[PDB]
Amino acid sequence: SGFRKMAFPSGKVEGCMVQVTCGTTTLNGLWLDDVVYCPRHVICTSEDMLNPNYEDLLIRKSNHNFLVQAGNVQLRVIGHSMQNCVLKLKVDTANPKTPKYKFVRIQPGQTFSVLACYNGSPSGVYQCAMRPNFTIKGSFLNGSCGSVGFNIDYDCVSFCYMHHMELPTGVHAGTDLEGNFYGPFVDRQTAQAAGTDTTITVNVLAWLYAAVINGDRWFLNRFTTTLNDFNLVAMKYNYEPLTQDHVDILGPLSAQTGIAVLDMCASLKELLQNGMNGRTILGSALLEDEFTPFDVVRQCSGVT
Amino acid sequence: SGFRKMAFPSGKVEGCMVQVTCGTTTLNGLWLDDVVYCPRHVICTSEDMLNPNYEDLLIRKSNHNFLVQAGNVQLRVIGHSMQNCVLKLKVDTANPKTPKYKFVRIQPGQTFSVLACYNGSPSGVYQCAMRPNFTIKGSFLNGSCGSVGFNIDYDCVSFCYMHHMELPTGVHAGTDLEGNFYGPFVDRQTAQAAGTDTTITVNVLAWLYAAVINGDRWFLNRFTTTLNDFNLVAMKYNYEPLTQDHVDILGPLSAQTGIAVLDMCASLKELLQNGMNGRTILGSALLEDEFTPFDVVRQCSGVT
Ligand SMILES: Cc1nnc(CN2CCC=C(F)C2)s1
Ligand SMILES: Cc1nnc(CN2CCC=C(F)C2)s1
């Protein structure tokens, strides 16, 4: 029993973190096989960051200008290229700790673990969601750039996020491991405003199911609703619209609890309209939206 | 910027988890040097658990009855002893992944990371606090017993917790790595009620400082208070009394923010008396008490 915001065990990713230095900029890189992946703004001065021409800046850089340190041992850079917003540094040594891995581009609402790192050294691990406005709400200080987000399936790490920047509002933006930003963000120190941070409805419902499984049931009511009726309420409260795809994904939690998805929607609708009246659900005073249905199944079933 | 409930990177502990089986009971063990540590109730049938005589049950067990598997390789048990509520299985092989480590018995209010494990396999990592009633609010299913709680100081893992049981109220109880329960709990399937789960005041204040550092400042008010006056309010709200030791520990956060500790106490007092009025602090609708002052400094400064 009990339900916690849980990160994947980070060991497989810890074994992949290195320090990258170019001139006087140090950040984190990800060493997989004989490639180190890092944010391309490693090549920028904070002056460069105001309006960088990355192709022009990169002309001035040779392999030997990229200092890559794995623990306290230097890696030899034998090649470098830019792919979108990441640099790929080819090194002469395959990372011996390379896990089975994939690169995935996640959808908004998907959760992942972040291994926050500084100078190639892991500091902590926490669980994030890709927000519907393609930001994440992380914990990143200066030097954390190149820290990565990941999911683990048994022994395979799916890397989905590399940290690139903080918006002036203190939310975070980054790329997949092909260097494509999530959302409309660019790796430039300029005005970039996030859109509406809507609530991930299907995740809230998953978490309500998790609550029922764990004995928090006070919010269950006598009502049901329809997708269309629920969606009018969702719109009013800046919740994402619920689709039949979302209902389908919640089917196993519906089956396990015997609470129809549309009944749980009606419970959520009343919570939106009435608030929590100073009560809590799984130790939260607000409706948690950073657990996916898959997360809830995993934690509630004990997958390793 | 940003402030997250952050666990220590778990790799060093992942390398220590093994499966222990005795008869038909399987749970987790901790392999450090040539000793595997696990809950002594590994020797019990669920029938035994109602009123176990562990010394009498252990007489019937030989080294070869303890099956210890590290990944998919069996360890040879060459000795076994009971220390309090843990078994120590001497194996013929030192764990090659043994980190620098210590065993510490933590105080109520102290935070630590849990590596939830099943069959010796890590499933997830999350951040816990030892509650003032010596319970923790974890996420533990059947098979998670022997999962451990830890802090990391640079390269040294301080193990503080091993998971033993769930109370009928679905909160968790366990031992230090000398096998002494936190609190009055016993490893028996009997009525065991937790005492008052009071709020860890010094942790709430730390988290309020974290909020100010991260730009959440709406709750700062024009007032101050005294320890005695604050403590009358704390008592009323089932908060732990604040001592000058707690004020001393908050000194660096006071210094960094320029907010006197007693001023932040007066802010907390108003939040207790007035509630949040539907507002949030660091994305929470309730006052978070599972960050220590040391945690807040660490996360806000970026220690690795
Ligand atoms: C060199 C650097 N100087 N500042 C940095 C942080 N941010 C600034 C905004 C945009 C990013 F992509 C990187 S990197
Ligand atoms: C064999 C076991 N059968 N049930 C177990 C879980 N709990 C029950 C309560 C008290 C504990 F120490 C262990 S262990």
Curated annotation (Swiss-Prot), chains A, B:
Entry's localization field: Host cytoplasm; Host Golgi apparatus; Host nucleus
Regulation: Inhibited by pyridone-containing alpha-ketoamides compounds 13a and 13b. In turn, alpha-ketoamide 13b (tert-butyl (1-((S)-1-(((S)-4-(benzylamino)-3,4-dioxo-1-((S)-2-oxopyrrolidin-3-yl)butan-2-yl)amino)-3-cyclopropyl-1-oxopropan-2-yl)-2-oxo-1,2-dihydropyridin-3-yl)carbamate) inhibits SARS-CoV-2 replication in human lung cells. Inhibited ex vivo by michael acceptor inhibitor N3. Inhibited ex vivo by compound 11a and 11b.
UniProt superkingdom: Viruses
Positions in the Cytoplasmic compartment: 1-304
Domain Peptidase C30: from-to ranges: 1-304
Catalytic reactions of this protein: TSAVLQ-|-SGFRK-NH2 and SGVTFQ-|-GKFKK the two peptides corresponding to the two self-cleavage sites of the SARS 3C-like proteinase are the two most reactive peptide substrates. The enzyme exhibits a strong preference for substrates containing Gln at P1 position and Leu at P2 position
Catalytic residues in the record: 41, 145
Crosslink position(s): Glycyl lysine isopeptide (Lys-Gly) (interchain with G-Cter in ubiquitin): 5, 90
Effect noted on mutating residue 189 to A: Does not affect ability to cleave and inactivate human TRMT1
Functional note: Cleaves the C-terminus of replicase polyprotein at 11 sites. Recognizes substrates containing the core sequence [ILMVF]-Q-|-[SGACN]. Cleaves and inactivates human TRMT1, preventing tRNA guanine(26)-dimethylation of tRNAs. May cleave human NLRP1 in lung epithelial cells, thereby activating the NLRP1 inflammasome pathway. May cleave human GSDMD, triggering alternative GSDME-mediated epithelial cell death upon activation of the NLRP1 inflammasome, which may enhance the release interleukins 1B, 6, 16 and 18. Also able to bind an ADP-ribose-1''-phosphate (ADRP).
Record note on quaternary structure: 3CL-PRO exists as monomer and homodimer. Only the homodimer shows catalytic activity. Interacts with host FBXO22; this interaction promotes the proteasomal degradation of nsp5.
Stated name of the protein: 3C-like proteinase nsp5
Originating organism: Severe acute respiratory syndrome coronavirus 2 (2019-nCoV)
Phylogenetic classification of the source organism: Viruses, Riboviria, Orthornavirae, Pisuviricota, Pisoniviricetes
